[PDB]
Scaffold this active site. Structure first.
Site, short mmCIF file in Angstrom:
data_model
loop_
_atom_site.label_atom_id
_atom_site.label_comp_id
_atom_site.label_asym_id
_atom_site.label_seq_id
_atom_site.Cartn_x
_atom_site.Cartn_y
_atom_site.Cartn_z
N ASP A 12 -1.36 -4.10 -3.16
CA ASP A 12 -2.11 -2.81 -2.97
C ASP A 12 -3.56 -3.00 -3.23
OD1 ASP A 12 -2.41 -0.07 -2.35
OD2 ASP A 12 -0.71 0.60 -3.63
N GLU A 56 0.84 -1.22 0.00
CA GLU A 56 0.00 0.00 0.00
C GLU A 56 0.88 1.28 0.00
OE1 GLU A 56 -2.94 -0.36 3.15
OE2 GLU A 56 -3.83 -2.06 2.03
N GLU A 63 -6.46 -10.51 -1.25
CA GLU A 63 -7.30 -10.24 -0.05
C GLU A 63 -8.75 -10.05 -0.50
OE1 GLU A 63 -5.65 -7.01 2.40
OE2 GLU A 63 -3.60 -7.62 1.88
C1 LIG Z 1 -11.39 1.65 13.57
O1 LIG Z 1 -9.99 1.16 13.92
C2 LIG Z 1 -9.88 -0.14 13.37
C3 LIG Z 1 -8.57 -0.38 12.62
O2 LIG Z 1 -8.09 0.78 11.94
C4 LIG Z 1 -8.91 -1.57 11.71
O3 LIG Z 1 -7.92 -1.81 10.70
C5 LIG Z 1 -8.95 -2.72 12.71
O4 LIG Z 1 -7.74 -2.91 13.47
C6 LIG Z 1 -7.26 -4.04 14.28
C7 LIG Z 1 -6.44 -5.13 13.54
O5 LIG Z 1 -7.37 -5.54 12.47
C8 LIG Z 1 -6.64 -6.14 11.22
C9 LIG Z 1 -6.49 -4.91 10.28
O6 LIG Z 1 -5.74 -5.51 9.16
C10 LIG Z 1 -6.57 -6.42 8.46
O7 LIG Z 1 -5.85 -6.86 7.31
C11 LIG Z 1 -5.33 -5.73 6.47
C12 LIG Z 1 -6.44 -5.07 5.73
O8 LIG Z 1 -5.71 -3.85 5.28
C13 LIG Z 1 -4.70 -4.21 4.20
O9 LIG Z 1 -5.42 -4.53 3.08
C14 LIG Z 1 -3.71 -5.19 4.77
O10 LIG Z 1 -2.90 -5.64 3.69
C15 LIG Z 1 -4.36 -6.39 5.46
O11 LIG Z 1 -3.36 -7.00 6.27
C16 LIG Z 1 -6.85 -7.62 9.33
O12 LIG Z 1 -7.73 -8.47 8.61
C17 LIG Z 1 -7.60 -7.18 10.55
O13 LIG Z 1 -7.72 -8.26 11.48
O14 LIG Z 1 -6.32 -6.38 14.16
C18 LIG Z 1 -5.33 -6.19 15.27
C19 LIG Z 1 -6.15 -5.21 16.15
O15 LIG Z 1 -5.40 -5.25 17.39
C20 LIG Z 1 -6.44 -3.79 15.47
O16 LIG Z 1 -7.31 -2.94 16.32
O17 LIG Z 1 -10.00 -2.51 13.72
C21 LIG Z 1 -9.87 -1.27 14.40
C22 LIG Z 1 -11.09 -1.15 15.35
O18 LIG Z 1 -11.14 -0.25 16.21
O19 LIG Z 1 -12.00 -1.97 15.15
#
Ligand SMILES: CO[C@H]1[C@H](O)[C@@H](O)[C@@H](O[C@H]2[C@H](O[C@@H]3CO[C@@H](O[C@@H]4CO[C@H](O)[C@H](O)[C@H]4O)[C@H](O)[C@H]3O)OC[C@@H](O)[C@@H]2O)O[C@@H]1C(=O)O
Ligand SMILES: [Cl-]
Ligand SMILES: [Cl-]
Ligand SMILES: [Cl-]
Ligand SMILES: [Mg+2]
EC number: 3.2.1.8
Length: 333
Positions: free
Chosen positions: A189, A134, A258
Site C-alpha cells: 500500500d 491498496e 515502489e
Molecule cells: C491519467 O490516467 C493515467 C492512469 O490513471 C495512470 O495510472 C497511467 O496509466 C497507464 C498504465 O500506467 C501504469 C500505472 O501503474 C503504475 O504502477 C502502479 C502505480 O500505482 C500502484 O502504486 C501500483 O502498485 C503500481 O503497479 C505503472 O508504473 C504505470 O506504468 O500503464 C498501462 C497504460 O496502458 C495505462 O494508461 O497513465 C494514465 C494516462 O492517461 O497517462
C-alpha cells in the site's frame, strides 16, 4: 558503486520494469545495480486474465525467463487490485444495463481461481507476491475499525469486508500444496507514512494474522507488508520511521516496494531541489540500513526520470540520458 553491492548485506535492491528494460544499455544498467525486479504492468490482473478463463501468460513468461537468465530475481505484482483489473471479475450488467456487483459466491470463485491459477503458473520463478494491493482508504478517520476503513472497491462490494483475508487464504493454500516453493505473501500500500492509514493497515494485518496463527501453530498468513514509498520532497522521514516500526511490530518482513521521490513539475528539476531530493533519499536509506534485519528488499519504481510513471516530477536516481543525478549519490551514501 553498484547499488546492489552497497546494500548487499542489508536488503535486495530492486527496480520496476517493462519490456524496454531488457535490452541495450538499459539492461546493462538494470543488471549492474539491482538484484531483483518487479513487472511494472505485465503481471497485473488485466494483463493475465483479461476475460474469464482466458489466461494470457506468454509476454509475462518471456519477461520472467529473461530476468532469471540475466541473474536477477522477480517479485510478483499483483494478484488483486481495484485498478488495471477487468470488470468481469467482480461486476456484471443488470437488465437496465447498469454495472452492479456480482454476488459473493461468484466473485469469491473468480478471486480464488485468479490467484490460484496465476500462482501455480509461475511457481517459484518469483520470490514473493503482492497478493492484495491498496485496499485501505486514505487518511481513514476511524482506523480503529479496519473494516470500516477499507476502500469500498469492486471486490469489497461483491464479496464484503473479508475479501482481503480470503485473497490471502487462497494464496496460502497454493503454498500449502507446493511446500517446496519459497514465496513470501505481501500486502502492499501507499501513503503508509500517514499515521491513520498505517494504523488501519496494522489492525487489518494483525486481525488476519492473529486468527490464522491461532489455528496454525503460530504460522503467518501475511508474510510481508510493502511500504510503496511513493514519496515527495515534503515527506517526513520521522513518519516513515513510525510506520516502519509499526509494521515491524507485526512480526512480518517489510519491503519498500515502489520507492520514488517527486521533486518539481513539468520535467523541470531546479538545482536546489535536486539537492533536496538527494538529501531525503540519503535520510531514507539511513533509516532503512538501521532496520535492515527486518527489510527484505528496497525497490525503486523505475530506472530513470523520463520513463517514470511520474516522469513530469523527476523522481528517480538517473536522468533521461541514464546519467546519475545527485539522488544517486545520496543513496550510495
Ligand atoms: C491519467 O490516467 C493515467 C492512469 O490513471 C495512470 O495510472 C497511467 O496509466 C497507464 C498504465 O500506467 C501504469 C500505472 O501503474 C503504475 O504502477 C502502479 C502505480 O500505482 C500502484 O502504486 C501500483 O502498485 C503500481 O503497479 C505503472 O508504473 C504505470 O506504468 O500503464 C498501462 C497504460 O496502458 C495505462 O494508461 O497513465 C494514465 C494516462 O492517461 O497517462
Ligand atoms: Cl540502448
Ligand atoms: Cl535473449
Ligand atoms: Cl512442493
Ligand atoms: Mg511490465
Amino acid at each position: 558503486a553498484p547499488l546492489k553491492d552497497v546494500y548487499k548485506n542489508d536488503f535486495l535492491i530492486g527496480n520496476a520494469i517493462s519490456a524496454e528494460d531488457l535490452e541495450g544499455t538499459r539492461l546493462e544498467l538494470l543488471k549492474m545495480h539491482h538484484d531483483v525486479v518487479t513487472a511494472g504492468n505485465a503481471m497485473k490482473p488485466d494483463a493475465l486474465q483479461p476475460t474469464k478463463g482466458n489466461f494470457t501468460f506468454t509476454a509475462a513468461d518471456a519477461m520472467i525467463d529473461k530476468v532469471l537468465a540475466e541473474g536477477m530475481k522477480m517479485h510478483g505484482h499483483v494478484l488483486v487490485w481495484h485498478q488495471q483489473s477487468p470488470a468481469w471479475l467482480n461486476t456484471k450488467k443488470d437488465d437496465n444495463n447498469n454495472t452492479v456487483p456480482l454476488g459473493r459466491d461468484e466473485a469469491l470463485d473468480n478471486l480464488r481461481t485468479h490467484i490460484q491459477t496465476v500462482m501455480k503458473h509461475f511457481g517459484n520463478k518469483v520470490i514473493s507476491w503482492d497478493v492484495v494491493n491498496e485496499a485501505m482508504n486514505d487518511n481513514p478517520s476511524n482506523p480503529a475499525d479496519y473494516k470500516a476503513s477499507l476502500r469500498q472497491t469492486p471486490w469489497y462490494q461483491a464479496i464484503g469486508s473479508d475479501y482481503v483475508e480470503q485473497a490471502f487464504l487462497a494464496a496460502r493454500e497454493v503454498l500449502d500444496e507446493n511446500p517446496s516453493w519459497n514465496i513470501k505473501l505481501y500486502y502492499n500500500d501507499y501513503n503508509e507514512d500517514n499515521q491513520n492509514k498505517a494504523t488501519a493497515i496494522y489492525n487489518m494485518v494483525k486481525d488476519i494474522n492473529d486468527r490464522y496463527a491461532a489455528a496454525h501453530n503460530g504460522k503467518l498468513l501475511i508474510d510481508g507488508v510493502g511500504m510503496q514509498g511513493h514519496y515527495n520532497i515534503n515527506t517526513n522521514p520521522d513518519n516513515v520511521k513510525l510506520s516502519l516500526e509499526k509494521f515491524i511490530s507485526l512480526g512480518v518482513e517489510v519491503s519498500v516496494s515502489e520507492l520514488d521521490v517527486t521533486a518539481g513539475n513539468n520535467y523541470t528539476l531546479p538545482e536546489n531541489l535536486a539537492v533536496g531530493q538527494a538529501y531525503l533519499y540519503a535520510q531514507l536509506f539511513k533509516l532503512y540500513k538501521e532496520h535492515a534485519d527486518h527489510i527484505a528488499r528496497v525497490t525503486f519504481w523505475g530506472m530513470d526520470d523520463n520513463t517514470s510513471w511520474r516522469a513530469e516530477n523527476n523522481p528517480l536516481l538517473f536522468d533521461k540520458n541514464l546519467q546519475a543525478k545527485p539522488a544517486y549519490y545520496g543513496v550510495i551514501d
